[PDB]
Amino acid sequence: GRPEWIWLALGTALMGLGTLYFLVKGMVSDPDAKKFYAITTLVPAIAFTMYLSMLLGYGLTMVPFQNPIYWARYADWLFTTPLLLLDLALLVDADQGTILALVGADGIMIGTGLVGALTKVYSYRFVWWAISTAAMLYILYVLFFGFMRPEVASTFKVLRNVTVVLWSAYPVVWLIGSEGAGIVPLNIETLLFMVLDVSAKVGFGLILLRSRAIFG
Amino acid sequence: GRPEWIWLALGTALMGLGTLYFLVKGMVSDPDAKKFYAITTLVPAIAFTMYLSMLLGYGLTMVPFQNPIYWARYADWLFTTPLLLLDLALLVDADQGTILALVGADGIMIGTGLVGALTKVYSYRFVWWAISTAAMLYILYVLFFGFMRPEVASTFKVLRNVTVVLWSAYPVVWLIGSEGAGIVPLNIETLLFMVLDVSAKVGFGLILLRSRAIFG
Amino acid sequence: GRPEWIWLALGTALMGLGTLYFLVKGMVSDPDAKKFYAITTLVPAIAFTMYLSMLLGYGLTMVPFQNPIYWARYADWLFTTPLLLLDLALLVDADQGTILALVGADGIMIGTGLVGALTKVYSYRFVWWAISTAAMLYILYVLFFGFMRPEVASTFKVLRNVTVVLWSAYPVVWLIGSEGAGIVPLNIETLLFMVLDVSAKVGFGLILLRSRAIFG
Ligand SMILES: *C/C=C(C)/C=C/C=C(C)/C=C/C1=C(C)CCCC1(C)C
Ligand SMILES: *C/C=C(C)/C=C/C=C(C)/C=C/C1=C(C)CCCC1(C)C
Ligand SMILES: *C/C=C(C)/C=C/C=C(C)/C=C/C1=C(C)CCCC1(C)C
Numbered sequence: 001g002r003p004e005w006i007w008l009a010l011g012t013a014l015m016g017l018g019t020l021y022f023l024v025k026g027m028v029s030d031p032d033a034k035k036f037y038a039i040t041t042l043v044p045a046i047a048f049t050m051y052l053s054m055l056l057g058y059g060l061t062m063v064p065f066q067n068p069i070y071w072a073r074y075a076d077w078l079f080t081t082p083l084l085l086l087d088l089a090l091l092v093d094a095d096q097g098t099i100l101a102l103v104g105a106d107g108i109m110i111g112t113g114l115v116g117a118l119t120k121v122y123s124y125r126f127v128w129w130a131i132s133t134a135a136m137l138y139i140l141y142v143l144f145f146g147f148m149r150p151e152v153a154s155t156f157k158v159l160r161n162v163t164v165v166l167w168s169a170y171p172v173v174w175l176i177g178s179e180g181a182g183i184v185p186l187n188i189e190t191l192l193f194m195v196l197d198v199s200a201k202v203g204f205g206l207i208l209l210r211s212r213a214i215f216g
Numbered sequence: 217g218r219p220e221w222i223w224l225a226l227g228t229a230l231m232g233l234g235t236l237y238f239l240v241k242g243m244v245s246d247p248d249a250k251k252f253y254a255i256t257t258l259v260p261a262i263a264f265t266m267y268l269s270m271l272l273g274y275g276l277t278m279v280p281f282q283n284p285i286y287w288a289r290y291a292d293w294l295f296t297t298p299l300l301l302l303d304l305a306l307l308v309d310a311d312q313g314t315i316l317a318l319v320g321a322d323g324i325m326i327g328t329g330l331v332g333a334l335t336k337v338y339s340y341r342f343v344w345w346a347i348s349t350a351a352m353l354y355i356l357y358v359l360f361f362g363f364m365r366p367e368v369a370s371t372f373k374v375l376r377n378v379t380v381v382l383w384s385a386y387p388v389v390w391l392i393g394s395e396g397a398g399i400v401p402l403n404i405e406t407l408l409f410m411v412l413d414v415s416a417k418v419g420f421g422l423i424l425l426r427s428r429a430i431f432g
Numbered sequence: 433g434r435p436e437w438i439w440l441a442l443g444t445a446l447m448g449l450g451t452l453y454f455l456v457k458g459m460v461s462d463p464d465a466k467k468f469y470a471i472t473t474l475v476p477a478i479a480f481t482m483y484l485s486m487l488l489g490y491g492l493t494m495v496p497f498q499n500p501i502y503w504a505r506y507a508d509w510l511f512t513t514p515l516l517l518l519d520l521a522l523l524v525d526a527d528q529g530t531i532l533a534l535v536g537a538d539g540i541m542i543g544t545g546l547v548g549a550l551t552k553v554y555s556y557r558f559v560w561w562a563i564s565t566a567a568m569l570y571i572l573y574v575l576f577f578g579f580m581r582p583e584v585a586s587t588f589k590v591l592r593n594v595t596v597v598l599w600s601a602y603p604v605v606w607l608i609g610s611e612g613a614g615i616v617p618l619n620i621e622t623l624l625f626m627v628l629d630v631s632a633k634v635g636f637g638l639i640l641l642r643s644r645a646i647f648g
Contacts, residue, residue, distance in 0.1 A: 097466030
């Protein structure tokens with residue numbers, strides 16, 4: 001019924017297939033590699049469920065500021081974005097202190113994202129967007145300045161670059177889409193997030209899980 | 217007022233008493249044993265609070281598909297089921313990678329359980345049930361195939377068998393009860409969950425905390 | 433508009449400034465010290481966001497028992513109180529078992545706090561208050577009886593004393609304020625929590641982050 005259904009359906013499909021691929025691929029005894037397979041398989045598994053929830057209409061609510069807001073995205077990102085950061089952190093043997101900073105900053109990013117998404121005073125939505133963007137920028141700063149076997153170095157560099165590029169798109173899509181200024185229709189916005197989500201999840205995992213960096 | 221009150225009241229009582237028993241019993245210097253006492257005491261403490269919430273009417277909502285759904289169960293299981301899995305994982309010195317898989321799969325199980333519980337399209341409730349059951353089955357697979365001092369071996373075998381049997385009952389009760397097909401009345405369903413919950417929590421803890429497997 | 437706005441605004445300001453101070457101060461290579469800076473900076477960062485949410489009206493709901501309840505407090509405390517306990521636990525090199533007990537007990541404290549805050553049967557609100565207070569008392573007991581370099585000893589003693597005093601005020605404020613008996617107006621209650629929150633967060637962090645106890 002809703003025009004964006006096609007992109008929700010494809011996202012569900014692609015997340016589903018990616019999960020099954022990583023699950024089959026991970027069938028691995030090396031403790032380190034097992035950690036990467038676990039993190040990297042859980043990511044699209046979670047996204048699969050949240051995409052499904054949006055397709056079926058459960059992960060959608062109306063916010064008066066009567067705007068269709070897919071809140072399920074934030075339930076997804078609350079878990080999947082810290083997991084993706086753990087993949088990076090583990091590659092480089094990050095100190096626990098740096099892990100907590102990343103995870104905590106990420107929680108703030110998604111939580112303020114959600115508050116902004118659900119806020120009924122239009123102008124205040126963008127205050128929450130700004131705070132969330134600050135947390136994102138802190139995360140990007142830590143990834144470049146806050147942190148090594150050569151193969152770990154090469155793979156970390158690729159994944160970090162992928163991360164900086166894709167993650168930076170999210171706040172732009174939100175600002176111009178139905179959560180923000182409403183300059184890009186919900187249908188197109190759903191498509192953008194779908195492309196970003198699959199790349200950031202399945203794309204990312206493929207690069208990581210095909211590299212020898214994950215073995216001790 | 218509501219017929220199931222008696223089973224909510226007994227569950228609250230039994231969870232309460234089990235918590236106090238484990239608390240008194242744990243009054244223990246061995247680091248390993250302290251970890252088991254903590255996990256195993258927190259479990260029925262959480263369940264106590266969620267049983268209380270249901271007795272008092274706070275953990276109950278009406279879902280139109282006007283069906284009384286005790287959502288408090290899922291707030292309980294979200295924390296207590298991973299904790300029970302940590303008890304198992306620690307016994308056998310599981311690799312962190314295997315722990316994340318178990319915990320993550322468990323989160324998916326309960327989260328999709330909850331979505332199914334609260335879904336307003338009747339047919340879709342059972343799609344969520346199926347996904348949750350898949351996650352449960354993955355958990356059971358890991359417990360048997362994804363993993364040792366003899367006393368650890370004996371105790372792990374008992375607890376794992378208890379786990380496989382009791383946990384497998386939960387999806388059956390849900391399917392036939394008020395969350396699913398509505399073939400078994402809410403009153404009887406509440407009783408089944410109460411028996412399962414106490415066994416899976418207090419029964420489980422008694423077997424674990426009386427074994428010498430918990431000491432290094 | 434609402435009289436308590438001034439205290440929400442100052443709390444937001446003070447939490448904001450404290451976060452920036454700790455962030456600048458932490459600009460530190462020692463792994464141990466990094467852990468303390470992370471925990472201690474995240475704390476007022478979270479509180480900043482939740483104070484903002486209350487100022488802007490998002491973190492407030494009406495509970496019929498038509499009472500204005502700031503639920504945002506509990507979203508704050510759910511994360512910040514375990515973090516503050518981790519600061520203490522790490523100082524003294526607590527066993528993981530003791531950490532889980534503290535964190536778990538803290539989760540119960542805040543969760544039952546929230547249930548009480550949102551409960552529509554007046555008398556039952558204080559049952560939840562009593563359970564939460566029991567969990568708090570268990571936490572205080574562990575801090576004194578459940579647990580060392582001299583500088584670690586001195587700093588831990590100060591922070592623990594600060595903790596026992598400030599934390600014990602929270603249940604009293606709740607009982608006499610708008611969540612409980614309604615003997616102290618919401619405006620004054622908001623002020624009390626603001627003073628307690630800043631002391632418990634910024635005060636606490638200043639004492640910790642100025643001590644040499646945080647370096648290995
Ligand atoms: C698989 C999903 C991924 C990698 C999602 C990343 C999402 C973000 C980095 C979102 C950031 C946002 C802001 C920085 C501002 C407010 C809007 C958000 C939550 C989209
Ligand atoms: C103390 C509580 C325990 C051990 C609960 C275990 C609960 C489950 C294994 C529930 C499983 C479910 C499914 C597998 C399908 C959907 C319905 C659920 C959530 C009951
Ligand atoms: C920064 C915030 C801090 C340190 C908050 C501490 C809050 C508590 C210790 C609250 C305790 C409560 C009870 C013990 C009973 C019910 C009411 C609560 C949640 C305020």
